Design an enzyme around this catalytic site. Sequence first.
Site, PDB file in Angstrom:
ATOM      1  N   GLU A   1       0.818  -1.206   0.000  1.00  0.00           N
ATOM      2  CA  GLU A   1       0.000   0.000   0.000  1.00  0.00           C
ATOM      3  C   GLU A   1       0.884   1.303   0.000  1.00  0.00           C
ATOM      4  O   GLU A   1       0.657   2.286  -0.766  1.00  0.00           O
ATOM      5  CB  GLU A   1      -0.939  -0.007   1.212  1.00  0.00           C
ATOM      6  CG  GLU A   1      -2.128  -1.012   1.111  1.00  0.00           C
ATOM      7  CD  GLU A   1      -3.148  -0.781  -0.050  1.00  0.00           C
ATOM      8  OE1 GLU A   1      -3.068   0.272  -0.750  1.00  0.00           O
ATOM      9  OE2 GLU A   1      -3.985  -1.715  -0.188  1.00  0.00           O
TER      10      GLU A   1
ATOM     11  N   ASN B   1      -7.503   8.735  -5.995  1.00  0.00           N
ATOM     12  CA  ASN B   1      -8.356   7.831  -6.790  1.00  0.00           C
ATOM     13  C   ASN B   1      -9.053   8.541  -7.890  1.00  0.00           C
ATOM     14  O   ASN B   1      -9.359   9.743  -7.817  1.00  0.00           O
ATOM     15  CB  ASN B   1      -9.340   7.118  -5.870  1.00  0.00           C
ATOM     16  CG  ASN B   1      -8.630   6.405  -4.716  1.00  0.00           C
ATOM     17  OD1 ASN B   1      -9.009   6.482  -3.520  1.00  0.00           O
ATOM     18  ND2 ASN B   1      -7.534   5.747  -5.069  1.00  0.00           N
TER      19      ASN B   1
ATOM     20  N   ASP C   1     -12.003   8.510  -8.739  1.00  0.00           N
ATOM     21  CA  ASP C   1     -13.347   9.009  -8.342  1.00  0.00           C
ATOM     22  C   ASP C   1     -13.318  10.328  -7.530  1.00  0.00           C
ATOM     23  O   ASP C   1     -14.404  10.852  -7.183  1.00  0.00           O
ATOM     24  CB  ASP C   1     -14.167   7.925  -7.574  1.00  0.00           C
ATOM     25  CG  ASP C   1     -13.645   7.630  -6.172  1.00  0.00           C
ATOM     26  OD1 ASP C   1     -12.549   8.101  -5.816  1.00  0.00           O
ATOM     27  OD2 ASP C   1     -14.327   6.922  -5.418  1.00  0.00           O
TER      28      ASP C   1
ATOM     29  N   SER D   1     -11.719  10.623  -4.574  1.00  0.00           N
ATOM     30  CA  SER D   1     -11.253  10.285  -3.208  1.00  0.00           C
ATOM     31  C   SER D   1      -9.675  10.207  -3.171  1.00  0.00           C
ATOM     32  O   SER D   1      -9.009  10.217  -4.226  1.00  0.00           O
ATOM     33  CB  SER D   1     -11.897   8.991  -2.679  1.00  0.00           C
ATOM     34  OG  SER D   1     -11.447   7.869  -3.421  1.00  0.00           O
TER      35      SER D   1
ATOM     36  N   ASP E   1      -6.390   8.156  -0.895  1.00  0.00           N
ATOM     37  CA  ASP E   1      -5.898   7.166   0.077  1.00  0.00           C
ATOM     38  C   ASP E   1      -4.739   7.728   0.841  1.00  0.00           C
ATOM     39  O   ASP E   1      -3.854   8.376   0.251  1.00  0.00           O
ATOM     40  CB  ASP E   1      -5.456   5.892  -0.632  1.00  0.00           C
ATOM     41  CG  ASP E   1      -6.610   5.153  -1.328  1.00  0.00           C
ATOM     42  OD1 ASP E   1      -7.798   5.443  -1.141  1.00  0.00           O
ATOM     43  OD2 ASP E   1      -6.288   4.194  -2.039  1.00  0.00           O
TER      44      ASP E   1
ATOM     45  N   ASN F   1      -9.042   5.154   2.624  1.00  0.00           N
ATOM     46  CA  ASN F   1      -9.742   5.962   1.603  1.00  0.00           C
ATOM     47  C   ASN F   1     -10.685   6.987   2.254  1.00  0.00           C
ATOM     48  O   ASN F   1     -11.554   6.620   3.096  1.00  0.00           O
ATOM     49  CB  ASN F   1     -10.473   4.992   0.650  1.00  0.00           C
ATOM     50  CG  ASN F   1     -11.021   5.634  -0.664  1.00  0.00           C
ATOM     51  OD1 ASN F   1     -11.427   4.904  -1.628  1.00  0.00           O
ATOM     52  ND2 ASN F   1     -11.067   6.900  -0.717  1.00  0.00           N
TER      53      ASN F   1
END
Length: 129
Positions: free
Chosen positions: A35, A46, A48, A50, A52, A59
């Site tokens: 990660e 992301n 969309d 969002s 992380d 998220n």
Amino acid sequence: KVFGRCELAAAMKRHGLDNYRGYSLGNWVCAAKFESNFNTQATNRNTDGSTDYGILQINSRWWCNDGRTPGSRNLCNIPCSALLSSDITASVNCAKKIVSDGNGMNAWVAWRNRCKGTDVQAWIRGCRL
Ligand SMILES: [Cl-]
Ligand SMILES: [Cl-]
Ligand SMILES: [Cl-]
Ligand SMILES: [Cl-]
Ligand SMILES: [Cl-]
Ligand SMILES: [Cl-]
Ligand SMILES: [Cl-]
């Protein structure tokens, strides 16, 4: 902060992640490896809108507030910046809620694709712990 593998293993255990919801320490270390590469300050956008955040790439869509993810929740009741701290307490507390949400560690797509089913104990091999 960029953790060592055994250093992070030790911090995760110390914050009670070792065998939490039945996931051995190696699972958690392996997840953090793919990660964030053990880097507490890792952030990734992301598609969309969002983002992380942190060592376990939590998220903003669900788990933390970053003030720019329209319609998102903040289920860990935390600013997303608190997930970038050199002290992993916030990330661990939030990860506990994520792994309890019904799908286990599959919530981390890198864990499912790169850790799941593998020899995860290698990650903690040789660590005093
Ligand atoms: Cl490593
Ligand atoms: Cl393990
Ligand atoms: Cl938001
Ligand atoms: Cl906030
Ligand atoms: Cl820590
Ligand atoms: Cl499970
Ligand atoms: Cl060690």
